[PDB]
Write a protein that binds this ligand. Structure first.
Ligand SMILES: [Mg+2]
Ligand SMILES: [Mg+2]
Ligand SMILES: [Mg+2]
Ligand SMILES: [Mg+2]
Ligand SMILES: [Mg+2]
Ligand SMILES: [Mg+2]
Ligand SMILES: [Mg+2]
Ligand SMILES: [Mg+2]
Ligand SMILES: [Mg+2]
Ligand SMILES: [Mg+2]
Ligand SMILES: [Mg+2]
Ligand SMILES: [Mg+2]
Ligand SMILES: [Mg+2]
Lengths: 95, 120, 324, 52, 109, 116
RNA sequence: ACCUCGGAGCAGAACCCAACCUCCGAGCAGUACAUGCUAAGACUUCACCAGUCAAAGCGAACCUCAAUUGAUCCAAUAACUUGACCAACGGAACAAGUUACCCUAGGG
RNA sequence: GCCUGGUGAUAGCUGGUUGUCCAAGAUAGAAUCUUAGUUCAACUUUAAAUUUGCCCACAGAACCAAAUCCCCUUGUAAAUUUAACUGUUAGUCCAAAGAGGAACAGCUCUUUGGACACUAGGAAAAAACCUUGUAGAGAGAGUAAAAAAUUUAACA
RNA sequence: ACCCCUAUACCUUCUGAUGAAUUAACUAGAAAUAACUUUGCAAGGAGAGCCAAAGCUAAGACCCCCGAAACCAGACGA
C-alpha cells in the first residue's frame, strides 16, 4: 500500500478491501464466500447453503485487513437501522 | 526404521541363579532404588533424553532415589542402558528428624544415619 | 505383533476343507435365527450387552385337542379361515394357568420388584380383581400396568378375588414429593376375613392417587398378602410415608405376598381437588427441564463460522448501548 | 447431449429454477415447489440457458 | 508413461478413539469403505462417515452382522455361508452420558 | 485390529468358495461328471421324473451341476432332460442307480453316459 | 514426455510422506424435481481459498457414482441465473522464432 | 556516437553493513511465469492470561514386521490461549526401512532416529563415527571413549 | 631470546573459492497505523476537526550502502 501519500503524507486505504469486506468494531472482518454465485446448477443444496453465508475471517487475515485500511474504517458507526449492529460489541467472551 | 523398542517380560523375571548372584530376595523386595546416570543422552533418541530429565538424572554420577513401583520401573526400563540401579538398603532405620542432617549415602548402596568422621 | 485369541474364535469349528460338502443357509431367515442366537451368547470380546445392559394334564389335554380337531366344522371353518377364538375363555383360563408368570414379567418390567422389595421377586398366585366404580353402570378394571385417572380412582375400589387371612396394601412407588426413596400408601386393610373387604380393619384409610402436574406418569401398587396369624400393626404426608421393604421385613414371618395389580395415573383436575380440598396445601407443579445446549468455548477469531456464531454466545436479544 | 433450461412457475410467479433435460425429448412441465405460494405448482420451461 | 497418481492423503480414520467423551454431532470416524459400522447412537452420512447422535462415550464392539433383506449383495453373501457361519463386524457406539432432562418444581399453585 | 486378540473376527472369504476327469486314485474313488438323459414322448413324465431324480440327489447330498433339457425332434416328438451328477462311492453307485432303475414310471429310458 | 483431479503400491498396523517412481482412471452419465428453507455440533488434503458430514426445527412425503472440475474482475439478464481445453487447470484481459555480433548481472 | 538531463533509473543478482556483555534459538509443508524469490503455515522469540502438558495401563482402532494412535496412574514441569513481530529451510552424513540407478558414485528421491552447521576427549589427519555436554580460577583426584588379530595342503 | 610441548590465517559465499601491501581519514537502518512501557485525566479524553461499550492524550521504542546493460528528451560532433 501507500504508507505516505505525495499530497498529504498520510496512509491510504486499499479500496479493494473495503469493496469486499466488513469490519465489525470488535475487530472481526466479515466476508462473503468465494464462488457463491457461480455454477449453482452443479452444486448440492448443502453446498449452496454453505456459500450463501457471511463468514468471519482468520486472525492473520484480520490483521492484514487492518493494516490495509485506515482509522476511518475502524470507527463506531451508529447507523439508523443497521443489520449488523448487534454484532459490533462482543458479548460474553472469557478471552 | 529406527523405532522405540519394546522389551519382553521374560527379560525382567529373575532366576534363583540370579538371586544367588546378586543379593536379592523375591519375597520382601526393596522399596527404593538408587539410580545414577553413567552414560550420555547425546546420540540417544529424544525420548530417552526426556526420560532422563523426568527421573532427575541430568547430571551424571549423581545418585537419585526412586520408588520401586511399576510406573517408575517403566521409565527406568526405557533408559536402563544409560543408568545404574541399586537397591537402597538401610542398615539402621530411615532417618528420624534427629538424624536428618547427619546422614551419608555410602558407595555400597547403604544410607547410614550417623556419619561421624572418626575411625572405628 | 499378533496376540492369540483369548477364548475360541467364531467360525472356527465349522471351518472345514470341504465347504461344498457342508449344507448352507439357503435363506435369509435361518441366518437371522442363528445370528440372534450368537448375539445372545456370552462372549469374551467387548459387546453391546456390556455397555447397554401332571400325566393327567397331558392325558386330558391330548384327548381334549384330539376331540377338538375331530369336529368337521372346526376343520372346514379353519381351512376357510373364518374360524375365530372366544377371547373370554382364553382370558379366564389365562387367569388360571400361566397368568402369574406373565404378571411377574410385568412387575419386573415396571420395576416393582427392584423398588417395592429391593429385588425380592415372587409370583402372584392369586388372580386378584380390583375395579373402580365409574358412576353406577360400569366400572374401570385394574389390570397390571393400566392407565386409570384419579377421577375414576376418587372412591375406594371394589376388590373381588377367589380365595380363603389377608392384608391388602396400595402404594405409590414414585409419587413421593420430598424423599426420592419412600412412597405414600393410600389404604392398608388388614386381617381380612375371606374375600369380603369391608370387614377388614381399616388401618390407613383411602386416599385417591395424587400425581403432581407435569411430574410424569405414576405407578400404583396393589399388594395382596396371604396372612397366617392375625397381627396388630402400628392427611399428614409425614404420616402416609413409609417403605414397603422394611414394612414387610417386620411382618414377613407370618405373611407372604400372593397378589399384584398395579396401574398408571397422570394429573387431572381431581388432583387439584386432592391437594387443595383435603390435603390443605398449594399444589406443586413440575416441568420437564432439558439440560442447556453445549456450545464450545468462544474464540476471538471464529474463523469460517457464519455470522450466527455471535448469537450462540449472547444472552439478551435486545440492543445494548454500553457507556452511551 | 443435455441442456440446462430454466423453469418458470405458472403461479406465484417470477419464480424460476434450472434443470437438465435431453436435447431431444420434449419441453418439460414439472410439479416443483413454489416458496411464494408455498405449494407444489406446475412449472413450464421457457428458455434453454446453456447446452452443457 | 505413468501420469496421474499425485493425489494427496484423505486424512481419514478415527477421530474419536474408544473412551473419548463426545458431544452430539461430532464426527467419530470417516472411512472410504465400511471399516466401522454405526452402532447405538451413531449416525452415518452420505460419505460413510460416522458421527454421534448423543453426548457420551465412544465404545467399539464386535457384533453379529445381519444386513437388511433388501440389500441383495450382503444377503446373497449370507446364503452362501455354511450352517454355523456367522458374520461379525466392528461397531461404534456412543454410551449416552446425561439423562435427557429432569423434572423440576416450577410453581406452588 | 492386527495386534488385538480379536484380529480377523470379521473375515468371511474363507467361508465362501467364490470360484473334468474322474477321481479314482488309491482308496477314495469317485466318478467324474455324468449325464442322465431322459427321453419320452411326454413332457409330463420326463419333467416330473427329472424332478424326482433331482430331489433324490438333493436329498442324498450330491453335486448336481445342471438340470437342462435338450431340444426335441420331429418324428411324434421325443423329449430329453439332462440332469448332471458328479461324485459317488462304490456302494453309492449301486444304491444310487438301483432307485433310478426301480422308479421309472412308463417307458422312459436312462443313460449314465458321461460328458462329451 | 509432461503440467489439474481421483484409486492402488511405494507408505504392511492412527494421520502424513517424494521421484522424468510403478500401475489404473477422470474432465461424465443416469434418476429425480421438497436436488425446499433453516440449524446444534464436527471433519478437512498439512496455510489460505476451496472442500466435506450433520442432529433438532419449519415445510413436505408416507439421489447413484471416486474423480466427474475453474477464483476475482468483468460481461449478458427485469430478475433468477448463465459465462473459459482461463487444461500452463490459484487462472496476466490480449504478445512468435533467433543472435558465432549478442549485451549486462550472476552461478558452475 | 558522445555529452547533459530524467537519475539516488532499475537490479528477486554480486559485494558490504562499524562499541561491550549476557540470554533464548535449526529442517513439516502449500501455492506461485514458481523452484537465485515471495506469501501463508510450521519452527523460532518476547510479553500476558490461564490450566494442564509430557511420560503413559487396562480396554480399544478392517476387511480385502519394527512400531504407532489412544491413554488413567506415576515421574515430572510444562503446556495451551491472548498480544506483537522478525528470521530459517535443495540441508549434509551416519544407522535403519525402502524407490530409481549397475544391489556404481562424496549419485538421485522418501521415511524413522541421531549427529553436524554449539564444547571437549578419542579414532593418524578428521563437519556428520565413539565418549561427552552449561560454560570461571587451581602446579588436586576418579573416570569415559580409547592400542587389530592372523600363517596355511607329505603319504598307505 | 630460540631450542621442549600445544596450535589447519581472517572476512564472505556455500550442508561443510571471494576479498584485503600497509597507515591515516572518510564510508552503510531513515517511517510511530496497531500492540507494549511510562505519565496525565478519566465516562470521558484532546488547546475546535478526532476517537470513546475504559477510554483518550503525551512520550519512548521499527524499517541500510555500493554496483549494470538500458530507455527517453535536448544539445555537441564529418
Ligand atoms: Mg498415491
Ligand atoms: Mg503428495
Ligand atoms: Mg489442515
Ligand atoms: Mg501456470
Ligand atoms: Mg498452477
Ligand atoms: Mg540499487
Ligand atoms: Mg528482481
Ligand atoms: Mg545460550
Ligand atoms: Mg500464473
Ligand atoms: Mg528469484
Ligand atoms: Mg487424557
Ligand atoms: Mg567483519
Ligand atoms: Mg567538416
Amino acid at each position: 500500500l501507500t504508507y505516505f501519500s505525495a499530497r498529504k503524507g498520510k496512509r491510504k486505504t486499499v479500496k479493494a478491501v473495503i469493496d469486499r469486506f466488513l469490519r465489525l468494531h470488535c475487530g472481526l472482518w466479515v466476508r462473503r464466500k468465494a464462488g457463491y454465485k457461480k455454477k449453482l446448477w452443479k452444486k448440492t443444496p448443502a453446498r449452496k447453503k454453505r456459500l450463501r453465508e457471511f463468514v468471519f475471517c482468520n486472525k492473520t487475515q484480520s490483521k492484514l485487513l487492518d493494516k490495509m485500511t485506515t482509522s476511518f474504517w475502524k470507527r463506531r458507526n451508529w447507523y439508523v437501522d443497521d443489520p449488523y449492529q448487534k454484532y459490533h460489541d462482543r458479548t460474553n467472551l472469557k478471552v | 526404521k529406527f523405532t522405540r523398542s519394546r522389551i519382553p517380560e521374560k527379560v525382567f523375571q529373575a532366576s534363583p541363579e540370579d538371586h544367588e548372584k546378586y543379593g536379592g530376595d523375591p519375597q520382601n523386595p526393596h522399596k527404593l532404588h538408587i539410580v545414577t546416570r553413567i552414560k550420555s543422552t547425546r546420540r540417544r533418541p529424544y525420548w530417552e533424553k526426556d526420560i532422563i530429565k523426568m527421573l532427575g538424572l541430568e547430571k551424571a554420577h549423581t545418585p537419585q532415589v526412586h520408588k520401586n513401583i511399576p510406573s517408575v520401573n517403566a521409565k527406568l526400563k526405557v533408559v536402563k542402558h544409560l543408568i545404574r540401579i541399586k537397591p537402597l538398603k538401610l542398615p539402621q532405620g530411615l532417618p528420624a528428624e534427629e538424624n536428618m542432617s547427619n546422614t551419608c549415602l555410602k558407595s555400597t548402596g547403604e544410607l547410614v544415619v550417623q556419619w561421624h568422621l572418626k575411625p572405628v | 505383533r499378533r496376540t492369540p485369541p483369548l477364548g475360541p474364535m467364531p467360525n472356527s469349528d465349522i471351518d472345514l476343507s470341504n465347504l461344498e460338502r457342508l449344507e448352507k443357509y439357503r435363506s435369509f431367515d435361518r441366518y437371522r435365527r442363528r445370528a440372534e442366537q450368537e448375539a445372545q451368547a456370552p462372549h469374551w470380546w467387548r459387546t453391546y450387552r456390556e455397555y447397554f445392559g401332571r400325566t393327567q394334564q397331558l392325558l386330558e389335554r391330548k384327548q381334549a385337542i384330539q376331540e377338538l380337531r375331530a369336529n368337521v366344522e372346526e376343520e372346514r371353518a379353519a381351512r376357510l379361515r373364518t374360524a375365530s377364538v372366544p377371547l373370554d375363555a382364553v382370558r379366564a383360563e389365562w387367569e388360571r394357568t400361566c397368568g402369574p408368570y406373565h404378571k411377574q414379567r410385568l412387575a419386573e418390567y415396571y420395576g416393582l420388584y427392584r423398588d417395592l422389595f429391593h429385588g425380592a421377586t415372587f409370583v402372584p398366585r392369586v388372580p386378584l380383581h380390583v375395579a373402580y366404580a365409574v358412576g353406577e353402570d360400569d366400572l374401570m378394571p385394574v389390570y397390571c400396568g393400566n392407565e386409570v385417572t384419579p377421577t375414576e380412582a376418587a372412591q375406594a375400589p371394589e376388590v373381588t378375588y377367589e380365595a380363603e387371612l389377608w392384608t391388602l396394601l396400595l402404594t405409590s412407588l414414585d409419587g413421593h414429593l420430598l424423599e426420592p426413596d419412600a412412597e405414600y400408601l393410600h389404604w392398608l386393610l388388614t386381617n381380612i376375613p375371606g374375600n369380603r373387604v369391608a370387614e377388614g380393619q381399616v388401618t390407613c384409610p383411602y386416599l385417591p392417587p395424587f400425581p403432581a402436574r407435569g411430574s410424569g406418569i405414576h405407578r400404583l401398587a396393589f399388594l395382596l398378602f396371604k396372612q397366617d396369624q392375625p397381627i396388630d400393626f402400628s392427611y399428614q404426608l409425614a404420616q402416609r410415608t413409609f417403605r414397603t421393604f422394611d414394612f414387610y421385613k417386620k411382618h414377613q414371618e407370618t405373611m407372604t405376598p400372593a397378589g399384584l395389580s398395579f396401574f398408571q395415573c397422570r394429573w387431572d383436575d381431581s388432583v387439584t381437588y386432592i391437594f387443595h380440598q383435603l390435603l390443605d396445601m398449594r399444589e406443586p407443579v413440575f416441568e420437564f427441564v432439558r439440560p442447556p445446549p453445549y456450545h464450545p468455548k468462544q474464540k476471538r477469531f471464529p474463523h469460517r463460522q457464519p455470522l450466527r456464531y455471535l448469537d450462540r454466545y449472547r444472552d439478551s436479544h435486545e440492543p445494548t448501548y454500553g457507556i452511551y | 447431449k443435455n441442456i440446462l433450461v430454466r423453469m418458470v412457475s405458472e403461479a406465484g410467479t417470477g419464480f424460476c429454477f434450472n434443470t437438465k433435460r435431453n436435447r431431444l425429448r420434449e419441453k418439460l412441465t414439472l410439479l416443483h415447489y413454489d416458496p411464494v405460494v408455498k405449494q407444489r405448482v406446475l412449472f413450464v420451461e421457457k428458455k434453454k440457458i446453456r447446452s452443457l | 508413461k505413468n501420469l496421474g497418481g499425485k493425489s494427496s492423503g484423505r486424512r481419514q480414520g478415527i477421530k474419536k478413539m474408544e473412551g473419548h467423551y463426545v458431544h452430539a454431532g461430532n464426527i467419530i470416524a470417516t472411512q472410504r469403505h465400511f471399516r466401522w459400522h454405526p452402532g447405538a447412537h451413531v449416525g452415518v452420512g452420505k460419505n460413510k462417515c460416522l458421527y454421534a447422535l448423543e453426548e457420551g462415550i465412544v465404545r467399539y464392539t464386535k457384533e453379529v452382522y445381519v444386513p437388511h433383506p433388501r440389500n441383495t449383495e450382503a444377503v446373497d453373501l449370507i446364503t452362501r455361508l455354511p450352517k454355523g457361519a456367522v458374520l461379525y463386524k466392528t461397531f461404534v457406539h456412543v454410551v449416552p452420558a446425561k439423562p435427557e432432562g429432569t423434572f423440576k418444581l416450577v410453581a406452588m399453585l | 485390529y492386527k495386534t488385538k486378540p480379536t484380529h480377523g473376527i470379521g473375515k468371511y472369504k474363507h467361508l465362501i468358495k467364490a470360484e473334468v476327469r474322474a477321481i479314482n486314485l488309491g482308496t477314495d474313488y469317485e466318478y467324474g461328471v455324468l449325464n442322465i438323459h431322459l427321453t419320452a414322448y411326454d413332457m409330463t413324465l420326463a419333467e416330473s421324473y427329472a424332478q424326482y431324480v433331482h430331489n433324490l440327489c438333493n436329498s442324498l447330498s450330491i453335486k448336481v451341476e445342471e438340470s437342462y433339457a435338450m431340444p426335441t425332434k420331429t418324428i411324434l416328438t421325443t423329449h430329453e432332460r439332462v440332469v448332471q451328477i458328479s461324485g459317488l462311492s462304490a456302494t453309492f453307485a449301486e444304491i444310487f442307480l438301483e432307485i433310478i432303475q426301480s422308479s421309472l414310471p412308463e417307458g422312459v429310458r436312462l443313460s449314465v453316459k458321461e460328458h462329451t
